[PDB]
Symmetry: C2
């Protein structure tokens, strides 16, 4: 239902991950980059982790500092 | 998650399961079944399991092309 309402959000989030595939990225930083990239506010306000984890090849992990870090799986 | 207060052993039990499956991956359903086999008790979390797992340091979750959410311990 997310991808049906915002058809481009999947490509936009993947674009952001692709540009940050070296060190990973938090949800707050993703929203930040999203605003710079599209000139629009991030359209998901809830269940963001679940959305990110429905994108193939995307990983999430609990960092040392406790922060939730997202990345692309190494190929 | 406030379940750690109510169940002080749950961190070590879940970590034990992950350690025993650190080779490949493990799904939430498989974790709950390993949990019952290990403790003789049902898994005390009924919701937000991904969030619980992702608050354990060194644990990862990934979207397999099979669609299943796979959890593992991060390498090295």
């Amino acid at each position: 239902s997310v991808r049906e309402e915002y058809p481009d959000i999947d490509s936009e989030v993947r674009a952001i991950l692709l540009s940050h595939a070296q060190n990973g990225i938090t949800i707050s930083s993703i929203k930040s980059e999203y605003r710079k990239l599209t000139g629009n506010p991030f359209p998901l306000h809830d269940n963001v982790t679940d959305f990110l984890l429905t994108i193939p090849n995307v990983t999430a992990e609990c960092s040392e500092s406790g922060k939730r870090i997202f990345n692309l799986k190494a190929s």
